[PDB]
């Protein structure tokens, strides 16, 4: 915009006139010590006010040098909400496309103090879940675990080079949970979901094939009758 | 107001007199070192007190240069509550109209340290939901998922170029949740709500038609009946 | 309070003597460097201690120039608890009358770093609610929605130029919720409450006129009697 | 502790001798630059370390100048827990008598950055509550409201010049809550509680006069049986 | 420990050699400006690093001069967890014996920025509780309140000069709570507990003397029978 | 690898060359004033960057002088998670052994701003618990309290010189809780647990000896039947 | 993209010409005081902006000297979420592989202010669990505890040199909890899980061998009837 050009011209004019008066003040402007003090105060205020912008620019330069992410991939941070697919990497501001298709303008300085996670560069997608048996299938926990583990071992979509754990490890207050923890070969978010659904259906079939069943949030009641007779 | 102009003139006169005494102090005011100390202390205090206003002004300039938002679109921030429609962008503060029609005055400096989202520039509005089947019907999960996916694919208000996912991926503590995740073509908040309602009614029809039902928060009770005989 | 004056005079005298010794002590007081460093340290410590007090005054000046609120208006902030109707705006601290009829003295500095919302300046009061049908009456949602909408279209206390939405958009845990979102023409907190009550009663009448009903929080019990035979 | 009085004397002696050496160092001590930098570093360390005391003293002076509270009245802050009755106001700390009859020593600096509320200076006490009818009483809500309102218009202990609101505005999860919001004309904490109790008893009587019968959580049990034959 | 003395001697040697080189550098070395900047940077870094340690000592001096707590009384802070009995007060570290007989070493600096409560110096112990009647005995509230108030007024362990409030002021969701708020004469934690137990037993007797038994978390079931025919 | 000593030597060489150029710039380096500000800015940046590292070493020195803990002691802090058994105390980093036998490397600076508790030096271990009767055995509260108190007083593993409290002081939501609060003579975590188990079993025996019987959550229901006829 | 090298060379040129002009300005650029002011302002602003980047590099150097972790080791921090396996330690950024196989980029400065835990250097894995007996079978707690202790003492996968605790210590609101606390010899996350599953199954067998079942979330329901006849 032409008005933006006008604003830049005004800013550079103010800066350059300040520089000239400070640099050539001693020649004409008396009290070089007074000019020293005034310029020091002004510069200190300006810098301690614009430190945010300067940090943004320097963080942008750093991001450009070392690349925690590229345009295509999507990022997230446990410390702060910046999740989304990066659209543009600017000097001061980076635009990220959220998963609801909304722009998100992240100052670059934010990346100098938080740990940035890059799921776009991940190698595998993880499937984690719990079974949660019924406290009366305790005699069947071992066979259920073995069957689930064998099913996961022969699943085409499961990566056999990664960790594949199926173990009764929780012992919750209303169920005997069995952790299932594996990885898929694909990282597409549609093949992964299909594989997860298939694994879950196979798990249901395995659990119900034996005499076991999943548990609801059970209770005991100790019912008492106090209604008038 | 007259008093506002009076206050501005008083501030200007104070600035002028301090500038004059600092610049011409050496000529008449002795103690060049003492004048240095006094002026430096005063300037440091003033600047370290007004850094907030200076930051507001600089952030306003930056907002003018980089344009996260216009004067018509609505914005929000995950970090802080600034949600609303931008009413006007000032040099020091931005006036935003909240969705309950209340003015909100946001200092510009906060825009230099938070990530600003701009839903006003969004491309599509997303419909996300969960089914949560009655959990005693797991043999009907696949057919229900397929029917819902086909219904969404054939829906005229759903954008077919965006992600369209319908998958069982949960094992909820009381239900078999099926995530549904799609996008609409419109972004008007009135056609989007109508499309969402239509999709939800279609989903209800699909679920009921397949001999399934939505789940409530179930539990088991193990009745004891300790009432006195 | 003669002491108010005594302490002010004492502070003025201390400041004056410090200024005299720092400014006219260059010749009588030897060690220009020593007095320079002494005065610098003292002034720096005083400034770092009084930065908050100076910030209060500067923020008061800014509030006087830029006016987020006036005496009559009642304000609030998402970031801090300053809710109430402002009683007066001092240079250093503003006192606000809370809705308990209690005075609350808020320093001006806080207004330089928080978003100040001014509900006193609003144009409309918003009515928002949800219906939450039993989920056994999903066939009556649509009709009911329309009915409610029509009622809000004909209500004399509802502003027709503002947002007016009535839609099923939830799939709640135990009910089918219908968001109602409208604005009233008045902003007086007494006609608004009366209009809200009238709208709610009309909504009850509309819901019960059909075969629908509002839902309680339900769960499926599944009892397995284990009392001794 | 005579030794600590000697320690105080030693502290003041150290301060005075350091000042004298800094001011008389040049005459005997040499390397004006070295002495200057040593004094500067020492002063910077002392100022950065011993700043809380100066801030507390300045905040105490300010508290004396502008009086957010006096000795008798009790104060509270939404930001920090300082609730209690002011026992005495010192230069660095204030003693506040909590409602446990325990002394609480609040540094003065805290008062320079938090909003201080003075309930001791309030003009009225507020009675606020909700009714919460059964949800089978909708047809009787209106009259109920009116009745309650009338009971508050004729109550000797209710201030008629303040806001007096009685309205159905909630649509709660298990009840039809009616907000009651009024003010008493006493502020002594014993007649206020008595008036509140009287108003609550009158509200109970009014509600029972009609078939209203304040509600309970009221969940639907959606019962099923799986006990083996 | 001899090595502690060795470390102290090493620190003293480093300090003295630094002082000698910086203060007599010009007479022996050269580069007044270079030595000045080097010494300044070094001293500034050391001060920024040791500000916390210096603050500890300054806060210890203040804690001696102003005495929030003595050598035997127990303290606590709503801001920080420092609860316990003061074991000893050092120049930098204060040792407090927690109530589980475990030492706690708190830096003195913390006491300069938090409000310290000293229940060791309190005058009375407070008894506060709620009754919570069955909510079907509202006609008994007045007589029960009067009886409890008379019992408290006639109790020999209750301080009659302090506040003594017994009032129905709640409208809980499942009961009619009655606040009881009084003080005891003793403050020794063993007779206070005995008096509290006696008051509680007397309250139980008073409540059950009238047909106004206490309240449990009531509910309203609304059963739907869905068992297969 | 050699890279450690190589990097140390490189850092030493860089520091030495910087010192030489800055301190001999006076002789050959032109613009004696320019190099002064260059070195000043460089040193300010380096110190402001390494303040944390310097503070770590200073806090290590302080920890070596003042001894909150020794090698064998296991420590914990309410402010931050550092719980574990000290493994070694370094100059910058302290190595702690967690109770899950994992190393934990705590920067020494952490200990300069948090209160460190040292359970390793406890004198006694504490047993605290509550009984929780049923509201129907309120007539037995006194007798049970006396019996438990006598049992604790006669127990051989309980320290009689410490506080020994057994009192009804709660009025729980669904029970009459009796607080029990005593100390054991041992502090070894194995005899303490055995003594606690023995005390708990004796408490169960005492409670069952009378008809108290250890209340449950114990709510009320008020059944309403809406089942279709 | 050679533009990266071009921008790096531009930065080098800027930072070298600044040094050239500042160090040679005194020869040709007048106003030594003004030039010093400008240079100091620029350096101070750049330092405040790049302190974070400088701290990252210094923390990287220290992390190389002191080694909290190595490449293969997997680390975590109670303060920040940095959990994962270290991929590579850089000068400014450390790359860590999370357990969901995605990279995480942690600035080195984070390691200078948080305590880093290294379960990679862990020696033994811990098995900790709770039993929670039926809470009406307290007479069997001792026998169950002894049996479980013997089972753990005779288990070949349990380290007998570590702590091995099995004790009743809780009085849960619905159960009598037995804490079990032991260590396993292996640390491979696969034999540990197998050993934990075996121990849990043996615990179930022991608990059910002599009649004592696990507790559910019990209640005392107190049914009351208010349905119309
Ligand atoms: C902000 C302005 C950034 C301008 C360039 C900043 C440094 C250059 C980008 C980082 C890549 C780089 O060139 O690294 C060079 C070098 C990396 O270390 P090595 O020499 O390879 O070996 C260890 C010796 N200390 O130094 C650095 O840049 C790291 C320090 C960067 C501080 C900023
Ligand atoms: C003492 C505290 C500050 C008091 C002095 C200034 C009070 C505010 C003045 C009110 C008038 C005002 O701010 O006008 C807007 C003015 C900018 O005017 P423009 O012409 O639009 O921008 C051109 C810049 N190249 O804002 C400012 O300058 C803010 C100055 C920062 C201190 C306020
Ligand atoms: C407060 C000061 C307000 C105005 C400061 C002047 C800068 C405001 C931003 C104007 C736009 C801008 O400067 O961006 C251009 C420039 C592009 O980078 P270059 O290395 O110069 O070009 C190489 C591209 N191949 O970006 C910057 O340098 C931003 C500088 C902001 C510093 C403040
Ligand atoms: C702390 C150090 C001791 C306090 C020094 C000042 C104490 C406050 C003085 C009493 C209050 C007062 O009258 O002065 C308030 C004064 C404003 O006075 P006005 O005439 O209303 O503004 C006219 C500007 N157009 O504000 C201040 O200067 C307060 C400065 C305090 C920090 C020094
Ligand atoms: C840190 C080093 C501390 C060394 C001593 C610091 C001050 C001495 C402890 C305070 C003793 C004391 O008398 O406090 C009250 C006295 C108040 O001054 P008066 O002349 O008595 O009356 C009000 C006029 N200002 O001194 C103060 O506390 C105020 C200055 C304290 C700053 C420290
Ligand atoms: C940075 C490394 C600093 C190491 C030296 C710090 C002081 C020496 C270690 C502490 C031993 C010590 O003597 O502490 C007590 C002594 C305080 O004086 P006293 O001799 O106890 O009697 C009252 C006289 N005013 O020093 C201090 O603890 C305060 C100074 C610590 C500054 C750091
Ligand atoms: C910024 C980059 C800093 C790199 C250099 C940091 C120090 C060199 C690496 C550490 C090597 C080392 O082990 O030094 C230990 C040594 C510890 O003291 P000792 O000589 O062992 O005995 C006590 C004497 N007062 O020095 C230190 O590391 C502490 C100072 C480090 C400050 C950084």
Residue numbers in the entry:
A (entry chain B), B (entry chain A), C (entry chain G), D (entry chain F), E (entry chain E), F (entry chain D), ...: 111 to 339
Q: What did the article's authors report about this structure?
A:
Here we report the cryo-EM structures of the SMA2000-purified wild-type YnaI at an overall resolution of 2.4 Å. Consistent with the previously reported structures, 3D reconstruction of YnaI directly extracted from the cell membrane with SMA2000 reveals a heptamer. EM density for seven potential lipid molecules was found in the hydrophobic pockets defined by TMs 4–5 and the cytoplasmic region. In the E. coli inner cell membrane, phosphatidylethanolamine (PE) is the predominant lipid species, and this molecule also fits well into those densities. Therefore, we tentatively built PE molecules into the corresponding densities. The lipid observed is bound in the juxtamembrane area defined by two TM5b helices and a loop from the β-domain, which forms a protein-lipid interface. In our structure of YnaI solubilized in SMA2000, TM4 (MscS TM2) is shifted by about ~15° or ~2.8 Å compared to the other published structures.
Mechanosensitive channels respond to mechanical forces exerted on the cell membrane and play vital roles in regulating the chemical equilibrium within cells and their environment. The MscS-like channels are homoheptamers, with each monomer comprising a cytoplasmic domain and a transmembrane (TM) domain. YnaI is paralogous to MscS with a similar architecture.
